[PDB]
Amino acid sequence: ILDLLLLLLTIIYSYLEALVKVFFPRKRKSVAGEIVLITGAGHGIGRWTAYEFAKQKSRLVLWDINKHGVEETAAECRKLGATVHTFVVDCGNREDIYNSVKQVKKEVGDVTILVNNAGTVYPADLLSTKDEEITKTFEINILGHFWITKALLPSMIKRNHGHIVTVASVCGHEGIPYLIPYCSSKFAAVGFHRALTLELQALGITGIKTSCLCPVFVNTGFTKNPSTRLETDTVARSLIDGILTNKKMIFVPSYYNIYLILDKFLALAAINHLQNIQFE
Amino acid sequence: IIYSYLEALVKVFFPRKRKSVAGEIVLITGAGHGIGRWTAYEFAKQKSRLVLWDINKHGVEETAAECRKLGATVHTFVVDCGNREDIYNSVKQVKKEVGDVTILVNNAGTVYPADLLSTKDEEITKTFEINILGHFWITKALLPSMIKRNHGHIVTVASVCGHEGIPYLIPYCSSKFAAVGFHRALTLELQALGITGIKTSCLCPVFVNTGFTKNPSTRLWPILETDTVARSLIDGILTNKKMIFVPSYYNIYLILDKFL
Numbered sequence: 001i002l003d004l005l006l007l008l009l010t011i012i013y014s015y016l017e018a019l020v021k022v023f024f025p026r027k028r029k030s031v032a033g034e035i036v037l038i039t040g041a042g043h044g045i046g047r048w049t050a051y052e053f054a055k056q057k058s059r060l061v062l063w064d065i066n067k068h069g070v071e072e073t074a075a076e077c078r079k080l081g082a083t084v085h086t087f088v089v090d091c092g093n094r095e096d097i098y099n100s101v102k103q104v105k106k107e108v109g110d111v112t113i114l115v116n117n118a119g120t121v122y123p124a125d126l127l128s129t130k131d132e133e134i135t136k137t138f139e140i141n142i143l144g145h146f147w148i149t150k151a152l153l154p155s156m157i158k159r160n161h162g163h164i165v166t167v168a169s170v171c172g173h174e175g176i177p178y179l180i181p182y183c184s185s186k187f188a189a190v191g192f193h194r195a196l197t198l199e200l201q202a203l204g205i206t207g208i209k210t211s212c213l214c215p216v217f218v219n220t221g222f223t224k225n226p227s228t229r230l231e232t233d234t235v236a237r238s239l240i241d242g243i244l245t246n247k248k249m250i251f252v253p254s255y256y257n258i259y260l261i262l263d264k265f266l267a268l269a270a271i272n273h274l275q276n277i278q279f280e
Numbered sequence: 281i282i283y284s285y286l287e288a289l290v291k292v293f294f295p296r297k298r299k300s301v302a303g304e305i306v307l308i309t310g311a312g313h314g315i316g317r318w319t320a321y322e323f324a325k326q327k328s329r330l331v332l333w334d335i336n337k338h339g340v341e342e343t344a345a346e347c348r349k350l351g352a353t354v355h356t357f358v359v360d361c362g363n364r365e366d367i368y369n370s371v372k373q374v375k376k377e378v379g380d381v382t383i384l385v386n387n388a389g390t391v392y393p394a395d396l397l398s399t400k401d402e403e404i405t406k407t408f409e410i411n412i413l414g415h416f417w418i419t420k421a422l423l424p425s426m427i428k429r430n431h432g433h434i435v436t437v438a439s440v441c442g443h444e445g446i447p448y449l450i451p452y453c454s455s456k457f458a459a460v461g462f463h464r465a466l467t468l469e470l471q472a473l474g475i476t477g478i479k480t481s482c483l484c485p486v487f488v489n490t491g492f493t494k495n496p497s498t499r500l501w502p503i504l505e506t507d508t509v510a511r512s513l514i515d516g517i518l519t520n521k522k523m524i525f526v527p528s529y530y531n532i533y534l535i536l537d538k539f540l
């Protein structure tokens with residue numbers, strides 16, 4: 001541990017020095033006039049992402065099972081100057097999503113930015129979880145991503161223009177005890193974004209971008225406490241910056257991309273390779 | 281290249297301790313063919329008691345016939361491992377006829393290769409049901425006895441897909457990423473709970489010539505034979521290896537991939 005701590009310290013110094021050389025102005029795009037669909041926008045990350053998009057002069061479409069919350073979000077987005085359309089949609093229900101997309105096309109148009117934010121969690125050890133909760137976790141956290149993307153993606157492919165934002169979590173990269181189904185569904189969300197990015201690239205679709213939001217514990221009341229001993233508005237600012245600069249893997253806070261490559265390289269020769277493989 | 285030469289040296293010069301799985305009750309899902317079938321043969325040589333599961337009745341019986349020629353005691357069950365009800369009822373049968381399973385190999389899996397807009401919702405759901413949801417119900421059913429006896433082994437057969445994406449396999453890659461996640465969190469939760477006796481392994485092979493899919497996604501000229509992956513998995517289980525890559529050297533390539 002004495003020589004291992006000093007090897008990781010020298011690693012982190014040169015990693016935050018490489019990201020500082022490449023740091024020269026990344027181009028910020030305009031999302032003004034774009035049709036943005038935000039799922040789970042009735043509170044937290046979704047609600048504040050909607051406010052960020054409202055300031056950005058985007059056309060908003062807000063989805064959520066909570067009718068009151070989504071209307072409260074739309075009211076404040078309209079105060080910001082944006083046009084907003086709210087839909088009470090269960091984003092874990094394939095039928096509901098497909099029918100609601102028919103409504104969105106009729107009342108608003110063809111969605112150009114999709115933010116798969118809606119999510120659920122039922123904290124418990126595996127043998128205390130209920131099957132009903134496990135299935136519901138997968139339905140909202142990943143299966144729903146498939147049906148909404150499948151519905152909205154044809155028009156994006158037609159116009160060679162779109163952005164699929166997958167709100168996952170640090171959970172999609174590292175496990176957490178007592179959150180097995182949730183971590184699994186979040187790992188599936190990272191996978192979905194990953195394979196989608198490679199399939200879009202393989203198909204030659206140059207105009208559809210992808211982003212993956214992986215924040216640590218956020219004070220939104222989603223869960224009562226963090227697993228290891230971050231404000232909602234900060235994560236919204238981090239996500240909007242990522243989207244506007246076409247960042248594929250957005251970590252909140254950014255420096256967590258480093259902590260993740262500190263557990264994965266945790267034999268002595270595993271960190272040893274990550275040294276000379278990086279400084280070139 | 282250099283790490284694989286050093287890993288070959290460590291494997292012989294300082295061999296990791298092998299444990300005995302003789303007399304252990306091993307349940308292998310999707311044992312009617314491929315990785316599952318050859319894992320069953322490896323466990324049969326290891327003198328384990330086998331419970332083989334699969335939707336293919338003929339194939340699972342053909343596998344049992346060979347495990348019995350190898351000297352092992354085998355019980356087969358036609359179980360749909362994507363069906364929660366079927367799994368729960370079949371575990372009641374296993375406990376009545378065989379006993380408390382001590383090693384679980386979640387190997388059953390499905391795949392329907394297609395670009396996102398050509399996939400069918402029926403196939404996407406079925407991919408999740410067999411490749412990850414099924415892992416939850418079988419583990420949830422078999423775990424209570426392992427926790428009681430502080431002794432067990434949960435083997436999750438995932439894929440390189442669970443670490444890196446592949447075009448035209450989005451639902452499959454997503455379900456495999458979920459399998460890696462399930463294994464990782466299971467490991468940490470067992471550790472957090474103080475359960476020292478239940479081990480976990482994750483099998484992540486590259487393309488294996490089992491007819492699961494027609495061709496590999498990338499130019500892999502020395503293709504993986506089915507019997508090799510079975511040998512790699514048995515070595516991993518006997519040495520309590522948590523993340524088993526087939527071939528082993530993919531661990532440095534995937535760790536290396538995560539830059540710029």
Ligand SMILES: NC(=O)c1ccc[n+]([C@@H]2O[C@H](COP(=O)([O-])OP(=O)(O)OC[C@H]3O[C@@H](n4cnc5c(N)ncnc54)[C@H](O)[C@@H]3O)[C@@H](O)[C@H]2O)c1
Pocket residue numbers: 039040041042043044045046063064065066069089090091092116117118119120140167168169170214215216217218219220221222223
């Ligand atoms: N809050 C965290 O600790 C944290 C950290 C990392 C990732 N995340 C992810 O961020 C996302 C948002 O979490 P949050 O903190 O904003 O939660 P939140 O509780 O503040 O709000 C989530 C919103 O999703 C809605 N929602 C839930 N189920 C839905 C369904 N079936 N259909 C439609 N809408 C539904 C809720 O009504 C709510 O308005 C989730 O995907 C979560 O996994 C959260």
Ligand SMILES: NC(=O)c1ccc[n+]([C@@H]2O[C@H](COP(=O)([O-])OP(=O)(O)OC[C@H]3O[C@@H](n4cnc5c(N)ncnc54)[C@H](O)[C@@H]3O)[C@@H](O)[C@H]2O)c1
Pocket residue numbers: 309310311312313314315316333334335336339359360361362363386387388389390410437438439440484485486487488489490491492493
């Ligand atoms: N073969 C590969 O190239 C490859 C590579 C890496 C990982 N994998 C994984 O390895 C595992 C085995 O693949 P394989 O190549 O041996 O496959 P295979 O085609 O040889 O046979 C898999 C078996 O699973 C059974 N099965 C499918 N659905 C089932 C269900 N609902 N209930 C019970 N049994 C069911 C099938 O009947 C079949 O006998 C899968 O989980 C797959 O994801 C495959």
Ligand SMILES: O=C(O)c1ccc(NS(=O)(=O)c2ccc(Cl)c(Cl)c2)c2ncccc12
Pocket residue numbers: 168169170171174175176179215216217218222223225226227228229
């Ligand atoms: O809802 C969530 O996604 C969520 C995200 C992060 C949590 N924990 S954390 O921030 O301490 C953390 C930091 C680093 C890593 Cl590597 C990891 Cl895995 C975890 C957390 N904890 C409890 C309930 C939900 C969550």
Ligand SMILES: O=C(O)c1ccc(NS(=O)(=O)c2ccc(Cl)c(Cl)c2)c2ncccc12
Pocket residue numbers: 438439440441444445446449485486487488492493495496497498499500
């Ligand atoms: O069925 C599978 O799991 C499977 C596993 C691997 C495949 N491709 S591969 O071996 O070329 C390869 C090598 C390295 C990496 Cl990193 C990756 Cl992602 C992929 C593959 N291809 C087509 C259909 C199924 C599979």
